[PDB]
Design a protein around this ligand. Structure first.
Ligand SMILES: CN(C)[C@H]1CC[C@H](Nc2ncnc3[nH]cc([C@H]4CC[C@H](C(N)=O)CC4)c23)CC1
Length: 279
């Protein structure tokens, strides 16, 4: 099981929940709609503390994380429920998110094609574990693929995860399958979202850019298919080791995951096999 941390302990290790960025000497790593993420130091070890700011997503995170322990999923160390605020304690990921590394946020070097292939394989191994254990993530995106000291991919944020139709449509629209947008709950929707992640890895482009044509990255599949553009035209130029053949083998996997008809998309086990054959 997990550790029950006291609020006071979490308060002094996050320097009284210092909201100043790390870049100016504070403890704030990033904020989202459901809280603030702080850098902490417990057992000399660095930790990530999400102080929540909702209670259902707290319990859903603990529920899914108690059941799901894999090499390619972030690990939750514990939580704090007793004290003024709810916190979630995780293992620290020194290389942040795949989104940030692909955008080279804060001046970090571009990821090589070799690093990118491993991350794709890793993230897929994580999705396969989730699907084998009958869980649908519902928010597969690069911001939710974290990177450790060896740049091993770790799927994060199981707040919207589910063990089919719903009224409460959730996820990130730039990554969502057409049927997910209509209200269907299916593991096939996670496959589609992973296809967008593969496109981000090949291109280094964000899934949505309001000041770009096309605004949505998934739309380049149409441009390539209708021979208006090539996959080579889109390949991230911030790489020196991107081999044409393996880039084409990854784009084929991405194109397959982005099939508009959910039943024509491969299952996650087929995705792993395809990404393995690529290397
Ligand atoms: C924009 N950018 C600066 C981001 C800012 C947040 C960072 N988060 C992390 N950083 C390093 N170690 C980590 N371990 C675990 C996590 C996250 C914490 C938040 C959790 C949640 N349920 O929302 C998911 C797991 C984490 C990632 C980078």
């Amino acid at each position: 099981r997990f550790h029950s941390f006291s609020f006071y302990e979490l308060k002094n290790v996050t320097n009284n929940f210092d909201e100043r960025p790390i870049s100016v000497g504070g403890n704030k790593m990033g904020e989202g709609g459901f809280g603030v993420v702080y850098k902490g130091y417990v057992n000399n070890t660095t930790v990530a503390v999400k102080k929540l700011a909702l209670k259902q997503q707290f319990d859903q995170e603990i529920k899914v994380m108690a059941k799901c322990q894999h090499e390619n999923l972030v690990e939750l160390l514990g939580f704090s429920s007793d004290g003024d605020d709810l916190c979630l304690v995780y293992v620290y990921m020194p290389n942040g998110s795949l989104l940030d590394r692909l955008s080279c946020l804060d001046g970090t070097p571009p990821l090589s094609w070799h690093m990118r292939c491993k991350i794709a394989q890793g993230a897929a191994n994580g999705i396969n574990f989730l699907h084998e254990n009958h869980h649908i993530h519902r928010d597969i995106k690069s911001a939710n693929i974290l990177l450790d000291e060896a740049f091993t991919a770790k799927i994060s944020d199981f707040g919207l995860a589910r063990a089919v139709m719903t009224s409460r449509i959730v996820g990130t629209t730039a990554y969502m399958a057409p049927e997910a947008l209509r209200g269907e709950i299916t593991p096939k929707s996670d496959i589609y979202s992973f296809g967008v992640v593969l496109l981000e890895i090949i291109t280094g482009l964000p899934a949505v850019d309001e000041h770009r044509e096309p605004q949505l990255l998934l739309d380049i599949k149409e441009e390539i298919e209708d021979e208006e553009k090539t996959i080579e035209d889109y390949i991230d130029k911030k790489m020196n080791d991107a081999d044409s053949t393996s880039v084409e083998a990854m784009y084929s996997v991405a194109s397959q995951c982005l099939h508009e008809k959910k039943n024509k998309r491969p299952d996650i086990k087929k995705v792993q096999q395809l990404l393995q054959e690529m290397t």
